[PDB]
């Protein structure tokens, strides 16, 4: 997209993920992680986004907890309108909602709850 | 059709699942195509043809067709090496008998096959085909025909290679006896089977069948349902593990024994 | 000594079946069990 | 049995003395690894010194046996150096007599026979060394053959040397499923990586000594710093 | 070192056996871990006849054990049960039991609520190791 | 020294009247991977097992069957390096003697030469005998074939035999199953079965090496060819 | 197979196994063992449910070695300049003590 | 990781359903000083020795 996968967002994504590491937790801080994730959503539309969210999931990118918060908000925003049947695809693709690792966590439980509602 | 064996083979595999039986069948004519006397290329296309024909075979009932093909490939295969000849022929035959088929028709093919196997001189391969016969014959109710062949066979297996077969010849033999209805002989046949069986590890199913037949004697003729139930359970377990239809019949028997004992 | 064993085994099958008197099928079966021990080296 | 001044057949099934050669074959801390591709065959070694009153421009453990053939040696220094000299003469002679190039494999088999006799003598011991032969044949392509001084030699898909061989083997197997998917340099990179994990040392420009055999050349060359640093930099980018 | 102090103890066991077991109602069961130095007349019949020794496991036996434990870790279609069976060389029953308890312990630390192939292989090695280059047979 | 050392042998007469070193070599033999031989009369079958133990290998590199001549072949049980060396000296002797003459090799004469080299080492010291046992397999005309050679220095004729681990047990299996007229294809089926019974770690078309002597002597089987037989009866 | 002093060896060993063999469960009870050379372990210890974990010594890396030297040097008195790395080089095969 | 974690939660182990550790062994050359390695540990765990 114009500045989505060819300027601010993408360049910033590559430098951070190197800084953060997938082999470590927090060395950056969560703020940059959240900011990138909220910006990428704003940057692009529904068809582009789904491919992008899955990519990010490949890499660890901080705490189990940190990632879970970021994924949860994005699910919340996609929950509307015609955007709802494409959402079904995304939530299924990511495993941390049909799967636990640390599952005394409320955010994951909610996202499952929602899937049942669908 | 296509201009190559490779392209045609791939396209054919998908046709049965997508459209229907008729489309995959037309491609199988590689069998009556690119024939030689050398048979370097011709054998390679036959190996592909056996698998494609099996895929087709249950739905079509092409049992009759298969028969023409089985004879037809035979002098071709002999040519390149005896071992492949032996292998394609045996492999096809196993495929054939799985399906619903006429016994008479099958028995002619197996019968010619025995002669084919002598020609080169195989007691390894010949012994195996003779086994298949005892199983086909019993169903047709040529019980008498089964008894003699089995007696001759029991002597051959004993002395020669491969130890495992011997138990099967003994299992088929007791079945022969059961239908004739003279009870002691059958009780005695199974005991022999248990002896051989214990020596090496044998699957649950082989053993389980023996126990159904021990069971047949106990409930239906010695009326000792308590004991018969114990045999049926074991048999029931052996069948469950590898999945067989036999389990439902064993399940009937396990219920019946309780009713006879007079306990709802 | 190993003949004695054949007799001891024979009793076990019959007991398990809850029979009063031991028969030829069992007695043979026992011989068979002891014959397998002899077969192995 | 009596190892004391003779060596005999024993119920042990091996010899205490043969095991002892297997066991201590390094008295330093070098480790080595070799991988085979169809693009290269690479051996990765170390450079280490105890002081700097010593030179390092003649110190090496990679030998150029001949143009086509290369040999890295794991063994006692005295024994490694001797064997090379013996080999150098035998190869040359094979070239003279036959008029044709000596196969890599052929040398390993010939040398093996010389080892074996010494195993029969109770008046002389076998040399203590494991010899890894690497080369580029035009008759099966590149070839990687390891010898051990029991008289055993075999060709492998890749192998490792030093005292931590088994540990290196575990990485190797994972890797060895896919290795024909590596291009030229990317072979080299992975090769660096598996020694760095075992040994637990992120290398430095004067600690490493990569030797590569190159297909479509009869070259065995030890790589220049610029190329060696280019790789090292390359793994940083994936970290 | 001694054979007297223990002697009176040993006599008494013989006395008791003889005192009863004609209106049998009490069983006697023995366990040993160094049965290389029993008494000859600890074995004289009319005192002991069955000796049951521990065996190697069957392929099918290993499987059963594996089927029971996995139920607890929570299955996946990622893992295959079969590979776990295929990997062994048919070692003793203690060893097969040993690994199954261990695999669960690795998994919790890795923070998982499912199951992964890799921890079984780490766990598998931990018990198995000792291996060294040997054999001149064909080495 | 360069001529000093042990002039007399390590092996020595005992008040037992046995030869210690010799006794040990039966053990040395024992350790070998499973071997068999079947004589198909018109044919000959020899078979063995390649154990495998490192996934890291190449091709089917070294064998355990090497052709001495175009008519006789050896396979063995015992120590591998010894085998390579044993083959080289003999191989040299077979060609030189039977190119003086143009007659083709008689079987017994090879046996006589292998045994002598084995025996001289028993006579002399400094060097120890080899600790291998060989199966000399050949074909020629209507002659008998299939012969066995000991690290002892002794030879015997056989119709069938087995080597390697659990040699006595396998031979007892072999004894019962092997009788009368058989076929070259048939003999192969049996040998695989007898090897499987001795031990199977697995069998693939690369755990097995089978070679035969039949049409025009020794011929090496393709990997596919053997695999056809595995399917022909597993 | 004495019972000289050796009967006591058997007495203690048997006790260790008896606790495990029991209906006791080390419910929150932790065990740490120290052994100089391992070769006298029982066949019941290989199985967990007594000695679960057996950890080895590990010989320090040069970066560990630097750290250890550094923490030692630090309390005590010194000049103003020490090349730490040079000493790291000479040193190998030691533990912190 | 072995010792300390069971003390903090059995609960985490419990959900999975897995038996936790009882004993741990340290062996080798007493280059640390046998007793020193252990003693250093005792301090960290801060429990009833």
Coordinates of N, CA and C in Angstrom, one line a residue, chain C residues 11 30 39:
Chain C
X11 N -2.9 -79.2 35.3 CA -3.7 -78.9 36.3 C -4.2 -77.4 36.2
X30 N -0.1 -79.1 27.6 CA 1.0 -79.0 28.6 C 2.2 -79.5 28.1
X39 N 12.6 -76.5 22.4 CA 12.9 -76.1 21.0 C 13.9 -75.0 21.0

